[PDB]
Amino acid sequence: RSLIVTTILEEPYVLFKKSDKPLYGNDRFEGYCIDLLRELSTILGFTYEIRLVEDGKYGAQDDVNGQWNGMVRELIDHKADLAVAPLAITYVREKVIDFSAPFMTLGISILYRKGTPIDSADDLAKQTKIEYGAVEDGATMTFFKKSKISTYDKMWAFMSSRRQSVLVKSNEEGIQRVLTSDYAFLMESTTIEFVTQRNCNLTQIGGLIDSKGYGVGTPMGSPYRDKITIAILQLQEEGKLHMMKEKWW
Amino acid sequence: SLIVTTILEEPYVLFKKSDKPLYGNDRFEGYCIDLLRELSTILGFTYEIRLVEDGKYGAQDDVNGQWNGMVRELIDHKADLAVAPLAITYVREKVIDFSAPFMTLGISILYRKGTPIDSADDLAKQTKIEYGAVEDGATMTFFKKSKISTYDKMWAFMSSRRQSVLVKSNEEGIQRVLTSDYAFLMESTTIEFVTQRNCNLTQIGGLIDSKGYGVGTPMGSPYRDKITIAILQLQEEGKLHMMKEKWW
Ligand SMILES: N[C@@H](CCC(=O)O)C(=O)O
Ligand SMILES: N[C@@H](CCC(=O)O)C(=O)O
Ligand code: NA
Ligand code: NA
């Protein structure tokens, strides 16, 4: 049977294809992760239906009742067979779903305007004039919430106390905030790279604060777990992942 | 106690130096040894380190398809884990399981500074400067299977001059760079260790591919997910980075 693939809108990984005429079904979507899905489909021989995650979330655990949401929850509940998205492979998620080998490596960094003295997270941490934040309840925010590093704990103290204002619903909103107020956005380096190639007044500040990968998510115990990993390694070795990144970035 | 297979390779695994005799696991040190200890602290297992009997990483004999090295030790359940700079590859993942990568790297070129050589293409288009790789490892396999004209040219050169340009270990290749006119195709992580200690050497060109090192387990291992979880925990805590800083 066809697989149900959950994903999320996020440039340039997954986007609505533009056209004068209305598109339907899988035709509606394009991007790095859609090319990835197409390549995986060819290797493994499955057909699929792409469905945007119903609640529009990546997947985090509620801090009161411990329940999962987002693409992670859709996999736990067997509402999707695969998640193919810029979904960070994390310790807490791997406890509830399985990730393939990573198809992209990245890390947290800072998006901000050019031509300022700010050169690092420490530079942000030690002031309050320039506000900073991250996507609410994503892997980036979780990094700061969990960190025992003085600088990062101080940044978490700042962000959490200003959660209503500095934590945003999406990368888009974070970028929109950088462009409209004195605001620096903590976000994933791969996505920063796409943003900065299209906004020449924006730049990455400093280097990578951590390291992680994006991987394809499957429900724990899926008969596809190892098949997907093997296919990802095939695409990696074929140089296809590199071509895909060059195409979309 | 879990049996852990590994392989000598600076600075991942090496014999510890001491004025006094050493015994058991205490004979070994290195990044992978520290990693193994960290995995044990998280997962709570005890273990015995054993160097891979045949001293090989793991490849398939092209004649009979037989595996060797640490890969074979896992397939045959002669070890419970492999903790080493073992590349996560397509052919290996079909017969054993790898964790999430604890390190990311790529093939590159180890050679001298100040030369006319600035890329793999520069090596491929000549024959005065010899070049090669570790026999039967992931790097050699990259070249063997490549459809890129530059890399297939390099494979033709290496496979014909096997006895002369392919080496048995990274240490042998590095000494070859240091003592003859030779460029060594090898993994960028290990190159960085070498260039920090040999100021006349440098990496040439960028990474030619991308891959990770992972902990290997036999398929069906009850430890597979717990190992990946622990690796991800060490990643997030910054502990893998600290270990890399320690050994490099
Ligand atoms: N890619 C992230 C969301 C964005 C972010 O946290 O920076 C995740 O998987 O949670
Ligand atoms: N680490 C490699 C061996 C060295 C190399 O091929 O450059 C492997 O896993 O096969
Ligand atoms: Na899992
Ligand atoms: Na496998």
Residue numbers in the entry:
A (entry chain A): 431 to 544, 555, 566, 667 to 799
B (entry chain B): 432 to 544, 555, 566, 667 to 799
Provide the publication's sentences verbatim:
Desensitization of these ‘non-NMDA’ receptors involves rearrangement of a dimer formed by neighbouring ligand-binding domains (LBDs).
Consistent with this, we found that the K531A mutation results in slowly desensitizing responses with significant steady-state currents when either Glu or KA were applied to outside-out patches pulled from HEK cells expressing the mutant. In these mutants, both the R775 and D776 side chains adopt different conformations from GluK2 WT. Anomalous difference-Fourier electron density maps showed no peaks consistent with chloride binding for either K531A:Glu or K531A-T779G:Glu (data not shown). From the structural data, it therefore appears that truncation of K531, and the resulting loss of two positive charges from the dimer interface, disrupts chloride binding. For K531A:Glu and K531A:KA complexes, there were interface shifts of 5.1° and 6.8° compared with their WT counterparts.
